[PDB]
Amino acid sequence: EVQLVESGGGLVQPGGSLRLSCAASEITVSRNYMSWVRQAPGKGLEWVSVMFAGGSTFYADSVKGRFTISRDNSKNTLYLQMNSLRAEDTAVYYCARDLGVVGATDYWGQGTLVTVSS
Amino acid sequence: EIVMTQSPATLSVSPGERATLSCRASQSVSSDLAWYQQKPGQAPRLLIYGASTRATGIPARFSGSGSGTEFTLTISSLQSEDSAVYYCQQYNNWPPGYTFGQGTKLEIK
Amino acid sequence: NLCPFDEVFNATRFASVYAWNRKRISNCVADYSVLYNFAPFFAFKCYGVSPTKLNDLCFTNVYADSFVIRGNEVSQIAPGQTGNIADYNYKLPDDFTGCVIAWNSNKLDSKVGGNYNYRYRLFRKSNLKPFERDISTEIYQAGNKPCNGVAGVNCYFPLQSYGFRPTYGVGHQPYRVVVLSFELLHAPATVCG
């Protein structure tokens, strides 16, 4: 069925790097506005990053300059490289395909936990 | 950076009655909004997009309303499984932008 | 012998950022006394040429490109600037010398019924080449068929209305924008005075 499945979730020591990956089915991502969201345990949600259909990507300010989104279009998948994970970035990350005024964000990912050593 | 404030924080209503949840904006959000129901344990689920348009499949028991800086979601008859958390997401700036709320916990009796 | 720039900016018929409007000016004396000196202009800015020097500057031909955008997106009309309107709708080159001007039309073009007659572009397959008119009527989709035979999934239409109405805040008040491009290749330059 149409879906987004995630991988890369785990634990890493502060300052370390990590890479989250998102695979899709029955729907394309290369031509779909993709958006990674995250949730801190117990808190609300916050938009982390977005990549367009032409390649021009964008990131939130809280993570600006540190995270970089990319996607293997050839096999229909998305990726997000993170580095220098500090104490804040421990959260569950979701993958999403947002249309906007013509259908607000709808298809989401099972999520993936990302915690740090402490 | 428009800050959204949900209300009330919690709500416990007897089964079978109506339920009313308010979400308040700080600037003009016209009719650009959405409501997500994140049943505890997995990803959220879209209920109502734009101003009050009911997402496909979504049971008619839900109804959205409001415009400008104030919006409201209303549930006709809560069934046992309606207990979940709900969030109002605004999107007046679409490419790249979204701003979430604090969420609301709804239970039954 | 003055050019018709006056009309160009005051014709108050501007079409859309979708398939913008153009004019090829030639053989006249470009005054400029009013250009960027009239009162209700909100933003005017050129790169490579100073306004007064420009007023003494001279060229081979002129290209005027008028269109209408949302106020919060005027910052995206710039050399290589990245966003939506400047990536899939209308994209100006990197070495573009010349100036743009933008007016807050929060009164002249808006109606309570929704002055959304114009439908801007929100679904494109690949980025734009500079000055590539891409007015088109197709159905952006995901699966096999377009919306002619499918509905809901893979039923997208790139032309979305704006919905300009007065309750909208400044960030959503329709700004009218006009961009001037002076070409200097083989210039038996016919325009200065």
Author numbering:
A (entry chain C): 1 to 118
B (entry chain A): 1 to 109
C (entry chain B): 334 to 526
Excerpt from the paper describing this PDB structure:
Elite nAbs, mainly derived from the IGHV2–5 and IGHV3-66/53 germlines, showed potent neutralizing activity across Wuhan-Hu-1, Delta, Omicron sublineages BA.1 and BA.2 at picomolar NT50 values. In this study, we used single-cell sequencing technology to isolate hundreds of monoclonal antibodies from convalescent patients of BA.1 breakthrough infection and identified dozens of elite antibodies with NT50 values at the picomolar level. To further analyze the molecular basis for these elite nAbs, we determined the structure of Fab in complex with Omicron BA.4/5 S-trimers by cryo-EM combined with X-ray crystallography. Next, we evaluated the epitopes of these elite antibodies and found that these antibodies mainly fall into two distinct groups, which was consistent with the results of the epitope competition assay.
Group 2 antibodies, including TH132 and TH281, which target the RBM face and can be categorized in the RBD-2a community, directly block the binding of ACE2 with a similar binding mode to IGHV3–66/53 germline-derived F6129, CAB-1730, B3831, CB617, BD-51532 and ab133. Group 2 antibodies TH132 and TH281 shared the same germline origin of IGHV3–66/53 and highly identical binding epitopes. In contrast, TH132 and TH281 show a broad spectrum of neutralizing activity against all Omicron sublineages. We further analyzed the amino acid sequence alignment of TH281 and TH132 with other previously reported IGHV3–66/53 antibodies and found that several residue differences play critical roles in the cross-reactivity against different VOCs. For example, Y52F and S53A on HCDR2 form new hydrophobic interactions and hydrogen bonds with G416 and Y421 on RBD, respectively. R/Y99L on HCDR3 forms hydrophobic interactions with Y489 on RBD. Among them, G92N on LCDR3 forms a stable hydrogen bond with H505, a common mutation on all Omicron sublineages, and enhanced the interaction of antibodies. The results showed that TH132 and TH281 are new generation IGHV3–66/53 antibodies with broad and high efficiency, and epitope and sequence analysis showed that TH281 and TH132 mainly recognize conserved epitopes that are critical for hACE2 binding or RBD folding, including L455, F456, A475, Y489 and G502. Furthermore, there are two key escape mutations, N417 and Y501, especially Y501, which has epistatic shifts and enhances hACE2 binding, however, these mutations do not affect the neutralizing activity of TH281 and TH132. These results suggest that TH281 and TH132 tightly bind with the critical site for hACE2 binding or RBD folding and are well tolerated against the mutation site across different VOCs. Meanwhile, TH132 and TH281 target the RBM face of the RBD and can bind with the RBD only in the up conformation but recognize and tightly bind with residues that are crucial for RBD folding and ACE2 binding.
